[PDB]
Amino acid sequence: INNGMLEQSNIDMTQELVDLISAQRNFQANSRSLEVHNQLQQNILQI
Amino acid sequence: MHPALWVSKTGLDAQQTNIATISNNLANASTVGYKKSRAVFEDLFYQNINQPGGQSSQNTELPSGLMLGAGSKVVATQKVHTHGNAQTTTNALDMMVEGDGFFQVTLPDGNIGYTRNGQFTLNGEGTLVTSGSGYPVEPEIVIPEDAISITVGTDGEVSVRVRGQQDNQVVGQLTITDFVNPGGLEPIGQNLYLPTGASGDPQEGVPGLDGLGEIRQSMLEASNVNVTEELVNMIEAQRVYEMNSKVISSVDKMMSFVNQQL
C-alpha cells in the first residue's frame, strides 16, 4: 500500500483506436452482407 | 411442372446455403480461434435420355448423348483449419497453440470437448476454466491462493510463484490433442468441436513435442477469415442467384403464355 499515489486507467488509446477501426470495418462488412441478402429477396419478389 | 423449374430451384437452394455460409464467416470475423468454412458445389444426377456411347448402328456410335442434369447442390461446408494471426495481450491466462493441436475441456454431459480459443479464466476454486460457459480445462489446473504470478511454458507446464520462496512450484501440466483431419470435427458451438468418424481417433501429448503445437501464453489466435474473399464471393453468389431466378421467371412467363394460347 502506497500513499500519495493514484491508479489511473489501464487502457491504451492506441489499441482502443485500432479496435474501433476494426470493429467499424466488421460492422460495415456485415451490413453489406445484409444488403446483399435483402437485394436477393427483393429480386425474388419481382417475378 | 417444367424441368427447368426444378433444376433452377436447386440452383437457388445451393446459392442460399453458400451465401449463408459466407454470412456466418463475416459474423465470426472477431471470434478468437475461428476457422472459416467453404461451400462445395457439385452437380446432381443426370437424366439419361440418349446414352452417350450407345450403338447408333454397326461400325458407328453416338459420340455425345442427350443427358439432362438435375441441377446442383452444396454437398459440404468444409472447414479450413489454417492458423490465424497472433494477438499479443496483457492477460496471463489466455494462450495460443502455435501449430497443430486443440485445448480440451470437460463438457457438462461428461464428454471432453476440444477448442482452439484460448480465452481462459478461473472459477471460485481457482481451477482453470473457459471465459464463456466456464467449462473446466482438462487436465484440471488449480492455481493456489498463495500464487503471486502465473507462467505457462512452451511445453504446457503451468507454474506459479509463491511469496518468500524461490523456484517455480509446478501446479499442473496442459495437454493438447491433435487430429489427422480437423475438418471432420463437428462444431457444437461455443468454439468447441466433437470428434466424429471422419475426424479420426484423438491423439494426445505434451504441447511442443510429438508434432503438437506450442503453448504461447498471453497470446491469442484471431479468426482466419479473409473479409476480401467473403465480400467477393458474396457478389458472385448473388449474381448466380439472380440468373437462376431468371429461368424460373422465364418458365413462369412461358407457362402463362401456354395457358392463354393452348
Place this chain on the structure above:
Amino acid sequence: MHPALWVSKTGLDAQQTNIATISNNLANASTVGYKKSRAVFEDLFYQNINQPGGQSSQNTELPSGLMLGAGSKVVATQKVHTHGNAQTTTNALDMMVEGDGFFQVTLPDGNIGYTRNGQFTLNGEGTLVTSGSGYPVEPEIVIPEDAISITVGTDGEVSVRVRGQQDNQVVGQLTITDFVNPGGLEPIGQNLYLPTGASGDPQEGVPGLDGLGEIRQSMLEASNVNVTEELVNMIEAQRVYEMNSKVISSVDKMMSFVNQQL
C-alpha cells in the same frame, strides 16, 4: 372465398402491427425513460381435416395429420424493461433510478401514476413536479424559498441548505415503487404507467433497500431503444409484408382465371 386469401390477411395484419410497434420505438429514440416494445407473434388455430394419431387400421396411426393453419397474429406488445444509459446533466432537479423502481406522481383524477422519467421542475408554490404536464410528485417535496441549494441523496432523502444556517434542512423523503412485472403496467402516455391486474401489487419503500434502486441526482435515464435493431426489424417486416401480398395477388389472379374459363 379462398383459404389462402384469409390466411395472408392475418399475415398482413400482423406485419402492419409489427411495423407500427417499430415506428413507435424509433419515434421515442430520445424520450427520457422510455422502454422499447417488441411485438409477439403466435400462429392461429389449425383446422383439423385429418387427425394426427388417429387409428388408420389397427396397429397403425397417422404419423402426421392434415392440419391447415389459419395464419398468424400479434398477440402481445412486450415492453422490454432493461435499463437504459445515463445522461449526465448540470440540472439539480432531474433524478434517475439506478435499478428497479418507478417514480410516483399524483394524477389529476386522484390515482398515482408511475414514471421512469426523472425530469422534474418546480411549480409556483415550489412543489417538485414533472417537467411535462406538471403533476406533483408523491410524496410532495416543497422547497422553501429560504434555500440556496438542493441535494437529493442516494436513499431519496431530499435536503436543502438554508442561508445563514450551517445545517442541511431535510424537507422530504422520496419513495419509489417497484413491480414484479413492470412489463404488465398499462402505458397511458406522458411517460406514465398505471398498475394492472398482471402487474402485481405495488411495493413501496426507501430507494436503496429491499431491492429498490438508487436515486441519482443530476442524471437522466435514456431510452433503451436500439436503432440498429429497429431498422433491421423494419426491413424484415417490410419483406414479410410483401410476402403475403404476393400470395393474395396470386390468389386474385387464380380466381380471375377461373371466372374466365370455368
